[PDB]
Design a protein around this ligand. Structure first.
Ligand SMILES: *[C@@H]1O[C@H](CO)[C@@H](O[C@@H]2O[C@H](CO)[C@@H](O[C@@H]3O[C@H](CO[C@H]4O[C@H](CO)[C@@H](O)[C@H](O)[C@@H]4O)[C@@H](O)[C@H](O[C@H]4O[C@H](CO)[C@@H](O)[C@H](O)[C@@H]4O)[C@@H]3O)[C@H](O)[C@H]2NC(C)=O)[C@H](O)[C@H]1NC(C)=O
Ligand SMILES: *[C@@H]1O[C@H](CO)[C@@H](O[C@@H]2O[C@H](CO)[C@@H](O[C@@H]3O[C@H](CO[C@H]4O[C@H](CO)[C@@H](O)[C@H](O)[C@@H]4O)[C@@H](O)[C@H](O[C@H]4O[C@H](CO)[C@@H](O)[C@H](O)[C@@H]4O)[C@@H]3O)[C@H](O)[C@H]2NC(C)=O)[C@H](O)[C@H]1NC(C)=O
Ligand SMILES: *[C@@H]1O[C@H](CO)[C@@H](O[C@@H]2O[C@H](CO)[C@@H](O[C@@H]3O[C@H](CO[C@H]4O[C@H](CO)[C@@H](O)[C@H](O)[C@@H]4O)[C@@H](O)[C@H](O[C@H]4O[C@H](CO)[C@@H](O)[C@H](O)[C@@H]4O)[C@@H]3O)[C@H](O)[C@H]2NC(C)=O)[C@H](O)[C@H]1NC(C)=O
Ligand SMILES: *[C@@H]1O[C@H](CO)[C@@H](O[C@@H]2O[C@H](CO)[C@@H](O[C@@H]3O[C@H](CO[C@H]4O[C@H](CO)[C@@H](O)[C@H](O)[C@@H]4O)[C@@H](O)[C@H](O[C@H]4O[C@H](CO)[C@@H](O)[C@H](O)[C@@H]4O)[C@@H]3O)[C@H](O)[C@H]2NC(C)=O)[C@H](O)[C@H]1NC(C)=O
Ligand SMILES: *[C@@H]1O[C@H](CO)[C@@H](O[C@@H]2O[C@H](CO)[C@@H](O[C@@H]3O[C@H](CO)[C@@H](O)[C@H](O)[C@@H]3O)[C@H](O)[C@H]2NC(C)=O)[C@H](O)[C@H]1NC(C)=O
Ligand SMILES: *[C@@H]1O[C@H](CO)[C@@H](O[C@@H]2O[C@H](CO)[C@@H](O)[C@H](O)[C@H]2NC(C)=O)[C@H](O)[C@H]1NC(C)=O
Ligand SMILES: CCCc1nc2c(N)nc3ccccc3c2s1
Ligand SMILES: CCCc1nc2c(N)nc3ccccc3c2s1
Ligand SMILES: *[C@@H]1O[C@H](CO)[C@@H](O)[C@H](O)[C@H]1NC(C)=O
Ligand SMILES: *[C@@H]1O[C@H](CO)[C@@H](O)[C@H](O)[C@H]1NC(C)=O
Ligand SMILES: *[C@@H]1O[C@H](CO)[C@@H](O)[C@H](O)[C@H]1NC(C)=O
Ligand SMILES: *[C@@H]1O[C@H](CO)[C@@H](O)[C@H](O)[C@H]1NC(C)=O
Ligand SMILES: *[C@@H]1O[C@H](CO)[C@@H](O)[C@H](O)[C@H]1NC(C)=O
Ligand SMILES: *[C@@H]1O[C@H](CO)[C@@H](O)[C@H](O)[C@H]1NC(C)=O
Lengths: 747, 746
């Protein structure tokens, strides 16, 4: 039978299915099993029956906004390798866990007592996550770790105790440890004996102990007087394998060089949210880190201080392996050439992160002198013209996304000037720069008329982001100096397009021989001056969303009838959010014959002429989601041989015509979800020549469940080739007796 | 029995009800019937037969998407005065219209032929609207106007022919004409005999004839060469009563002063979208308008020309009665004191409009030397730091809305600097200005830290609009120099608020003795430094929408639970668009006790503690719309004696608890629309006292039309005083036979 309620594909995915009990309906060879997000309020020896090969179970957030597991529920398994209990409001570690477990996550529970009766028999444990049980203003109790609880686990590699009230590094920790997470534990003092016996440690996280609480975006309790963490100079002595060390928000004003004496493999050092300005300026510790790749010094600013310049010690010149340097929230006015002199001969330093410094001015010519910089991140500054709340599985101190969009960075050397003040680009702005492939000028409040001379000193820009400005496109030669331009993002430039009475000029689009992708979204374009057509021989993708094609294509106006025809290479066109009630036949027929993909979604369409699809022989995806459409042609096979994906969700369709679904041979993905369908006839499904369809989305329709759905329910069993996602969401709305029942639950 | 399908109140509003045809169910006392925006295809002599009392009928836009009207269909109606048929795709003026008609609207149809058989029989016509039949790129025919068609309408005071192709003014127009609209008619030439007989004309609209087509946001056909309209020197001679004249977009280059020799009453003169820069500079015609109140000179710019200065003729000093001058779209770089000299002795000139000129700099002291300027409109320029597509019923050339928001302007002198470049306000920025009550700094890209000195030169601002900037609130004394400040709008300053690691200070709010209305909307406020509370002893209304209260009030954080409690005078509070799935009990309890009106609408709320309304004895309106709420209490009368309006629309409410409609004695308006209610049973109706509800909104609920709905239908008949609106939209879901039908119809 069709897999229900789980999607099996060997893993079974039951997540977020509103299950009130563990499924007895589970498969046979099911191994990975995810029950997360369901409503299960009870667990037992009965609920899991017994099964075969299960190598994993995810019980997370059962139920959803606790859980009762009786002593010895998971008991007879012996196969159970990994078990995830997060967010179930557990007052205690469940008594009677299996001996098989190598992975256990108790994260985000009420467990205040870690005891031998819950743990010490777990000898096979590899990774154990106890994080986020007692923290912030949560009413909770100090965490008691029984003496030698972890001592019994001689295979233990990772241990995470973070965001719990500890006060001391637990003693008698197994020497097999690789990674140890102590973050935000209220530990004031680290002694010589705390970490002494762990010679295999590659990671130690002490962050958030004695935090720097000024301007905290969370409840923050400092050590007495706002004191630094106290780490004995021999604390790290036997730590020879250490790679990652997280000292963030330890309130450090001084860093003992002797900490790093026995730590030759050190790679990533996190010093964020401390008071390190002095140490950054002088910094004996910098001499001790020859293999260090990533150094994060972010948010060390002196409160209320705004110095003219940043003070970097010459000892930075001794990190020979340095790859990225993060200095955010240092807070200084100006970056001069000599200030970065110690970084310039570092062979591997490809990334400098200057975000959120309120920097007014920079001598850009310094970046040239650097050995090889790939990413120059200046976002969120003052640069002006040249003259539960926290993801427990994520880094708490800084975001992990790429600094620069990967699609932009792949082109080459990237300069990100976003969220600054450069409101006018003057003739010398970009002089003395490296050869910039990827440039981000977004959110500079730029109101200027780009004339074609502005980027001439960096003529090689491949990918240009001008989004969220005020640009006034009054010149046909704008941006044409960039010959190699490939991607251009003009989004959120609506300021001038909105005013009927100012001139508007898009003609520059045609000059580029390499332009591939162009984003005109959210510009409110309803009118252009003298040239109504967009023309490019190169252009591949055009994003036109958030404009007014309802105005451009108004029935009484023929000037814009051809607006997209001149893009002769175009395979992808996004027409969404143009407030279209209908598209004039002529206008639709004037869309490029080359189109493989067309998005009309989230308009007001009450009419669509299906016949017109005959003029688009390469059309693959047609996206009509989020409109008002009632009508479906019964003829589709006559208008397209190429259609693959058809997305109709969030429309008004109450009727599938006889011979609709299966008569298009090329159709794979059909999306009927969130429509008005009361049923599906035997006539809708035929099938003379078999359907290539691999996916059919029916969820969120008011199916009337009587014997009239019998044929569809029959069709589903006869085609298991066709998957209908979210079976738990394909639901009888009628009659009153069957309400809420899944369509496959009907007998 | 309540009225249906119409809402009778005597007029019937039947509009937008999806009617297939004229209802028979309309009351006989009914005078005016509005059938606009329905699905009715066919009008015949039996359509309105049951109604002889009809005076005014609105058939506009039927069907919604042609309309077939038989000959003499409306004939049997002896009392019909006003007949509005617009957007009906009518091929002809309907035959045999009743002679009683005073007002006829044929706007926006396919009628290309104006004939005696349709028009000339109606002697009582006052207003006749023919506009927008053949225009733009529409496929349409040139308009044939039969010689003498209007000659027989001796009562006709208004004729609108605009947006048709006339090619010349119709001869033989009646002398009763007051207003004549000829806009966009393709009339090249106005002769001396075109208007010679209209001695009662108050308004003449000649606009859009020989239009200026450069950068037009509509299909535009210029006269050959782009020539000016040709108006004979004597064309206006008998027009002595004219008040309004619209010459916009006639491609005028010179204006013949002689045209105005005979019109001593001229009040409003529209010259927009012409070639008039030369005239604006010399301008003999200004000698001729001592009674002109309103002069629109907008968009006379020379294409491609960005002169340093605007050049205003000294003859502007001859307009003694001028109230408002509109100079948009002249396009010049710098405004100097000397440039406005001729305007400065004009006693009544309250409004100056400089919008969309790309002005770089203004010598601001010039505005004082004017007699009295109430409104200085500088919006949409380059000012930097100091060193239906077309609604046929509206004005085509400019918007008619007030330049300044009336709520601001009412405080006093207004300066609107919005949509400019003043990104940093310097010490002298506002020097030598008049005493400014109403100030708009919106969308200036301002990133500065307001420190408390920036407004020192205009300390009397009572309404300040700071919206749509980059403002960095890093200083506790910000804005405190304005001690009379009543209204402060901070909307859309999110730039810095969204960065967790920069300091944020809202403490300045408390200083104001007179602060009434503060709008913090759409700032994405999730974190503050030090002071976590908003405090004011004055503030009446706080708009907090579009922030993150969901983060501020997060269960693990105690810091913001008092956030609004220190606003002691607070009555209206808007919590909408905060992504709230629920409000902690103590945080709700910490809302100001004085609230009359509380909006939590358009959040994610899954939960509401109704018992908490006990602490709000003044609470009148509670707006819960657009949430997830399932629950309502059966005890509500225990928790409030004060609740008047309760808005529950767009939630999931499966059932009403027992006697809910009779529960609260203060409750007048209850909104249950757009919910999951399948029935209202005997229980919701069961209680000792009676419903005092004057309104109950049920529309959009999936009602079950089986017999058990009958009980609620009796409750309806019992109380006719309880208004349930949109009854065509209160609709049976189950079962299939009754589906699509109003529950009132079963
Ligand atoms: C102090 O500084 C140290 C740095 O030394 C930080 O240590 C890191 O902590 C983060 C956050 O917990 C870790 O990130 C997480 O890693 C998990 C493990 O992944 C490893 O193994 C898997 C195999 O399953 C690989 O896929 C992966 O590449 C790694 O090899 C991931 O499971 C986590 O994934 C997260 O996102 C994905 C979605 O993209 C989800 O599927 C997950 O559920 C989860 O949300 C996450 O990436 C990181 O590994 C730690 N570093 C090291 C070297 O171990 C501390 O976090 C920091 N302390 C504080 C308080 O900030
Ligand atoms: C202006 O308009 C352009 C539109 O072109 C936008 O830029 C594009 O942004 C879209 C995101 O909407 C990008 O498309 C996405 O790329 C992701 C990254 O792919 C890279 O890496 C993967 C492997 O990890 C490679 O397969 C790929 O070749 C790239 O190297 C994909 O992961 C995304 O997939 C998502 O949708 C697909 C289906 O399409 C699913 O299969 C995925 O599960 C996932 O949901 C997606 O394809 C696109 O790359 C961007 N183009 C450019 C030129 O940058 C701008 O964002 C827009 N500006 C604004 C302000 O909105
Ligand atoms: C050339 O220049 C002249 C100015 O001299 C313009 O003439 C004006 O044209 C506009 C647009 O038609 C007229 O505005 C409309 O007036 C209607 C009549 O209002 C009278 O009656 C009402 C109530 O009885 C009074 O309140 C009012 O004072 C008048 O006595 C209104 O009904 C119209 O309102 C419409 O829109 C509004 C707002 O959307 C709605 O509230 C209404 O329901 C309705 O839909 C509208 O206000 C104006 O009256 C004309 N001026 C004069 C003095 O007569 C020309 O328009 C201009 N030419 C072009 C082509 O732009
Ligand atoms: C930041 O927040 C502020 C404060 O809320 C917003 O400013 C308010 O905006 C609202 C509308 O959004 C204004 O309310 C409206 O006022 C109109 C003016 O009414 C005056 O004049 C009429 C008669 O001429 C009198 O009846 C009245 O007492 C006033 O003297 C009303 O006409 C409006 O009423 C209509 O709509 C409302 C529903 O909104 C109904 O209640 C009415 O029955 C009627 O249908 C409306 O009440 C309010 O006056 C503004 N306050 C101030 C101080 O200006 C800002 O807009 C906001 N900023 C941003 C960017 O959003
Ligand atoms: C300060 O200046 C700004 C910018 O000019 C003013 O904002 C503008 O206000 C008008 C009038 O409210 C807005 O137009 C309106 O749109 C609404 C929303 O649909 C519509 O119902 C009205 O018919 C009206 O046309 C306009 O959008 C808005 N412009 C921008 C860019 O926001 C603001 O009013 C000024 N402040 C004061 C105190 O006057
Ligand atoms: C240029 O900089 C802007 C602003 O920093 C980047 O915009 C961010 O993009 C990511 C991905 O879309 C989002 O998570 C953020 O919401 C955006 N920030 C804001 C506030 O707009 C943009 O991605 C950058 N462009 C390139 C080419 O990397
Ligand atoms: C408003 C009339 C037509 C005009 N459009 C523009 C524009 N888009 N940018 C400018 C920049 C500088 C100077 C003038 C202009 C003008 S003048
Ligand atoms: C990032 C550390 C804390 C800071 N917050 C701000 C702020 N809101 N505005 C500034 C304006 C100028 C200079 C410095 C600042 C800083 S420094
Ligand atoms: C720099 O990195 C490269 C690999 O990217 C490596 O071969 C080289 O040894 C590194 N240089 C230093 C000094 O670490
Ligand atoms: C574009 O700008 C340059 C520099 O101002 C100017 O020389 C050129 O004439 C402009 N081109 C257009 C289309 O006006
Ligand atoms: C059309 O698009 C493809 C994909 O970008 C590209 O290979 C080809 O060069 C383009 N053709 C032209 C003429 O630009
Ligand atoms: C605010 O800025 C002013 C500058 O005039 C300064 O004097 C004051 O100290 C600042 N206030 C605070 C408390 O930050
Ligand atoms: C409280 O509100 C009213 C609003 O009209 C106002 O009259 C009164 O002065 C305010 N009280 C204080 C102390 O500001
Ligand atoms: C409502 O809030 C108060 C807490 O102050 C409590 O007495 C009552 O139980 C709450 N109701 C619910 C359902 O939580």
């Amino acid at each position: 039978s069709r897999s229900y309620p789980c999607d099996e594909k060997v893993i079974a995915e039951c997540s977020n299915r509103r299950l009130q009990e563990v499924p007895q309906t589970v498969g046979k060879y099911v191994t990975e099993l995810d029950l997360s997000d369901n409503f299960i309020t009870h667990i037992t020896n009965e609920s899991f029956q017994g099964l075969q090969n299960l190598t994993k179970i995810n019980l997370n957030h059962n139920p959803n906004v606790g859980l009762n597991i009786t002593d010895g529920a998971f008991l007879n398994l012996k196969n159970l390798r990994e078990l995830l209990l997060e967010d179930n409001q557990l007052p205690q570690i469940p008594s009677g866990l299996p001996e098989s477990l190598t992975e256990l996550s108790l994260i985000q529970n009420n467990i205040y007592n870690i005891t031998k009766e819950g743990i010490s028999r777990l000898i096979n444990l590899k990774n154990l996550y106890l994080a986020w049980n007692c923290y912030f203003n949560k009413v909770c109790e100090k965490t008691n770790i029984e003496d030698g609880v972890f001592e019994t686990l001689t295979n233990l590699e990772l241990l995470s105790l973070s965001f719990n009230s500890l006060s001391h590094v637990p003693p008698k920790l197994p020497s097999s440890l690789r990674k140890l997470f102590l973050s935000n534990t209220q530990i004031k003092y680290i002694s010589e004996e705390d970490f002494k016996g762990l010679i295999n440690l590659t990671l130690l996280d002490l962050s958030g102990n004695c935090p720097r609480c000024f301007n905290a975006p969370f409840p923050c309790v400092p050590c007495d007087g706002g004191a630094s963490i106290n780490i004995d100079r021999f604390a790290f002595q036997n730590l020879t394998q250490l790679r990652y060390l997280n000292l963030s928000s330890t309130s450090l004003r001084k860093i003992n060089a002797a900490w790093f004496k026995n730590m030759p493999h050190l790679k990533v050092l996190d010093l964020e949210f401390n008071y390190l300005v002095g140490e950054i300026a002088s910094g004996a510790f910098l001499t001790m880190l020859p293999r260090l790749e990533i150094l994060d010094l972010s948010f060390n600013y002196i409160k209320g201080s705004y110095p003219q310049h940043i003070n970097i010690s010459r000892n930075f010149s001794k990190l020979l392996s340095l790859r990225a340097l993060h200095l955010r929230g240092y807070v200084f006015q100006e970056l001069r050439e000599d200030d970065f002199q110690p970084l310039m001969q570092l062979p591997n330093l490809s990334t400098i992160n200057l975000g959120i410094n309120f920097i007014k001015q920079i001598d850009f010519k310094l970046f040239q002198n650097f050995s090889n910089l790939e990413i120059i991140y200046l976002s969120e500054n003052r640069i002006s013209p040249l003259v539960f709340e926290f993801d427990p599985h994520s880094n708490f101190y800084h975001f992990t996304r790429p600094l620069i969009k990967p699609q932009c960075a792949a082109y080459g050397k990237a300069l990100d000037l976003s969220l600054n003040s450069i409101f006018f680009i003057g003739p010398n702005q970009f002089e003395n720069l490296p050869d910039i492939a990827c440039l981000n000028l977004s959110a500079n409040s730029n109101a200027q008329v780009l004339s074609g001379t502005e980027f001439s000193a960096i003529p090689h820009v491949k990918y240009l982001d001008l989004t969220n400005n005020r640009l006034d496109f009054d010149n046909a030669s704008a941006l044409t100096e960039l010959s190699d331009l490939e991607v251009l993002d003009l989004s959120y430039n609506s300021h001038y397009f909105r005013i009927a009475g100012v001139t508007h000029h898009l003609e520059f689009i045609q000059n580029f021989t390499n332009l591939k992708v162009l984003n005109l979204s959210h510009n409110n374009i309803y009118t252009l001056t003298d040239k109504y057509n967009l023309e490019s021989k190169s252009l591949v993708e055009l994003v036109f969303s958030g404009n007014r094609l309802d105005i451009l294509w108004n029935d009484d106006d023929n000037r814009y009838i051809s607006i997209f025809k001149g893009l002769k290479n175009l395979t992808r066109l996004d027409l969404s959010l143009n407030r279209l009630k209908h598209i004039p036949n002529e206008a639709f027929l004037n869309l490029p014959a080359s189109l493989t993909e067309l998005h009309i979604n989230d308009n007001m369409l009450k009419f669509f002429n299906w016949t017109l699809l005959q003029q688009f022989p390469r059309l693959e995806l047609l996206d009509l989601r989020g409109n008002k459409l009632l009508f479906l042609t019964d003829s589709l096979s006559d208008f397209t041989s190429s259609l693959r994906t058809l997305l109709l969700s969030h429309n008004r369709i109450s009727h599938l015509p006889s011979g609709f679904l299966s008569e298009v041979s090329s159709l794979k993905h059909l999306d009927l979800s969130s429509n008005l369908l009361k049923t599906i006839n035997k006539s809708a499904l035929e099938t003379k020549t078999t359907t290539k369809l691999s996916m059919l989305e029916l969820h969120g329709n008011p199916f009337e469940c009587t014997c009239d759905i019998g044929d569809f329910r029959r069709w589903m069993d006869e085609h298991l080739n066709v998957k209908i996602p979210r079976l738990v969401d394909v639901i009888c709305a009628s009659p009153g007796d069957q309400r809420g029942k899944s369509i496959v639950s009907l007998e």
